[PDB]
Amino acid sequence: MTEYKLVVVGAGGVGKSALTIQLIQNHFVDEYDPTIEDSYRKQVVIDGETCLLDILDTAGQSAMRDQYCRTGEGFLCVFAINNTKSFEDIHQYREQIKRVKDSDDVPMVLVGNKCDLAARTVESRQAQDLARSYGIPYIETSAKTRQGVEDAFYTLVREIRQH
Numbered sequence: 001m002t003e004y005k006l007v008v009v010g011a012g013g014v015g016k017s018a019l020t021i022q023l024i025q026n027h028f029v030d031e032y033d034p035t036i037e038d039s040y041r042k043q044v045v046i047d048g049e050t051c052l053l054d055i056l057d058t059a060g061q062s063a064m065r066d067q068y069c070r071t072g073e074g075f076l077c078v079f080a081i082n083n084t085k086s087f088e089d090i091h092q093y094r095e096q097i098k099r100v101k102d103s104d105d106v107p108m109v110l111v112g113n114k115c116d117l118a119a120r121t122v123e124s125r126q127a128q129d130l131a132r133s134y135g136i137p138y139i140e141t142s143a144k145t146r147q148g149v150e151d152a153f154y155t156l157v158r159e160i161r162q163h
């Protein structure tokens with residue numbers, strides 16, 4: 001059965017853990033210990049293929065992190081649409097992933113999370129322009145409502161498959 005190794009990165013509080021828990025448990029967490037970093041497994045069928053997703057939920061700024069980063073096959077780069085700084089921070093995550101992989105062609109999806117909230121300070125167009133400069137998709141998500149969550153993770157799988 002095919003395994004896909006996914007790594008979820010981004011600034012504190014953007015909803016990395018909430019996105020992962022929503023994907024797996026179909027539940028929205030209001031507060032999740034920000035120090036817990038672990039990998040989680042989910043068996044899914046994607047485009048008729050039974051897949052095992054091995055998802056590293058990163059935390060902090062570690063051996064485990066360095067290990068999945070080096071062997072990680074695709075990256076969700078998450079910001080929150082009500083957190084301008086987290087959007088601005090994306091570039092640091094992408095630059096580090098490129099360094100790790102020594103490549104500018106890394107399977108990656110830009111994720112704008114918390115799209116259920118009204119205090120939007122990052123426009124969709126801004127994030128689209130950033131994603132276009134990186135040559136990657138942009139997808140908006142809400143870990144609260146589940147909007148976009150499956151699309152973000154499964155699109156990352158389809159990006160890994162083009163690689």
Ligand SMILES: Nc1nc2c(ncn2[C@@H]2O[C@H](COP(=O)(O)OP(=O)(O)O)[C@@H](O)[C@H]2O)c(=O)[nH]1
Binds near residue numbers: 017034115116143
């Ligand atoms: N309204 C809303 N809150 C979210 C969403 N995703 C995460 N949160 C909330 O934002 C905070 C940080 O989430 P968390 O997953 O711990 O962020 P992390 O530091 O990136 O792992 C929590 O209070 C979560 O309930 C979302 O999509 N919508």
Ligand SMILES: COc1ccc(-n2ncc(C(=O)NCCCS)c2C(F)(F)F)cc1
Binds near residue numbers: 007009
């Ligand atoms: C605003 O300035 C910032 C500087 C550094 C970071 N930060 N925190 C952890 C990591 C990391 O290495 N994660 C693993 C990457 C390989 S998988 C990084 C980054 F260097 F990438 F960005 C965030 C914001």
Ligand SMILES: [Mg+2]
Binds near residue numbers: 036
């Ligand atoms: Mg977390």
